[PDB]
Amino acid sequence: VKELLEAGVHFGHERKRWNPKFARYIYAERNGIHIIDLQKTMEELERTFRFIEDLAMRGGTILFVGTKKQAQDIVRMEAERAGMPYVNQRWLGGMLTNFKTISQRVHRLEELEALFAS
RNA sequence: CGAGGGGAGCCCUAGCACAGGUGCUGCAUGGCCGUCGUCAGCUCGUGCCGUGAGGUGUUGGGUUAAGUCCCGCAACGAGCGCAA
Ligand SMILES: [Mg+2]
Ligand SMILES: [Mg+2]
Ligand SMILES: [Mg+2]
Ligand SMILES: [Mg+2]
Ligand SMILES: [Mg+2]
């Protein structure tokens, strides 16, 4: 169940352009291909489940960034049914570091959106 | 008993405190004026890069008289300026 679709077809993305810190995962080339690994995907993926479960049941606002091209439509739907904040189009320049200015822009958003009722 | 000690202030016969330069110095100052310029630029808070001056905001594309304001972009935004 948790390893069927992960093992069905999950290979082939941007080949012969690869940062060689990923080199311990590709195990076979046949003609011009580079295979994304499966068994280490299961183990590191399981470590990620047991990390975000134990870290996230306390009530952490676990944010996720899907700004590439086509994870925008999946982040934009899964974020409302998830209950956690998100980002739509691009990462804002210094979103966490300039949270004073961005958060006081949200403080402006708390009173500009109340103008519609008046 | 005022035209007697004189009396509120003033006047002086002539004094005396201090005043007095359309002469330099804006190469000691405050207010100023002209100037580039009615072109569209100049700064600040936060955060990043860089040992640093500093850059990033204020870069690239589009167009307007215009830093007027959109897309991406480590930038998000404010103040004086084109306006009202
Ligand atoms: Mg400048
Ligand atoms: Mg600069
Ligand atoms: Mg720009
Ligand atoms: Mg102009
Ligand atoms: Mg402006």
Side-chain angles (χ1 to χ4, degrees):
Chain A
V1 177
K2 292 182 183 292
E3 67 271 14
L4 192 145
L5 189 274
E6 290 85 0
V9 173
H10 274 162
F11 63 96
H13 178 73
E14 196 176 4
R15 293 176 289 114
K16 197 58 71 177
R17 184 177 178 87
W18 56 279
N19 193 0
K21 283 90 170 65
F22 190 73
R24 71 264 185 98
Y25 291 157
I26 299 169
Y27 61 95
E29 62 181 0
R30 291 187 289 116
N31 51 5
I33 60 171
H34 295 284
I35 303 299
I36 293 96
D37 198 77
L38 279 69
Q39 295 177 357
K40 302 288 104 177
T41 300
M42 181 266 174
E43 293 182 355
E44 294 293 328
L45 181 63
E46 183 68 29
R47 292 178 68 249
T48 302
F49 284 120
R50 69 183 292 166
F51 181 75
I52 68 100
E53 184 177 1
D54 186 74
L55 193 275
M57 83 272 285
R58 293 179 181 177
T61 62
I62 309 300
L63 199 149
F64 51 92
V65 175
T67 60
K68 185 178 172 66
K69 190 261 182 182
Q70 60 187 356
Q72 299 176 357
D73 292 332
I74 299 169
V75 161
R76 189 173 63 89
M77 274 60 255
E78 289 292 327
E80 293 180 354
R81 68 179 293 275
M84 285 178 178
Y86 66 99
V87 60
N88 195 1
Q89 294 300 110
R90 66 175 179 87
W91 183 70
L92 273 299
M95 185 179 288
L96 272 303
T97 61
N98 202 2
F99 187 74
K100 189 260 182 181
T101 304
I102 297 170
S103 70
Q104 73 183 358
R105 179 60 64 195
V106 178
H107 182 74
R108 184 80 275 277
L109 188 65
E110 292 177 353
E111 292 180 354
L112 65 90
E113 293 293 327
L115 191 65
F116 294 99
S118 66

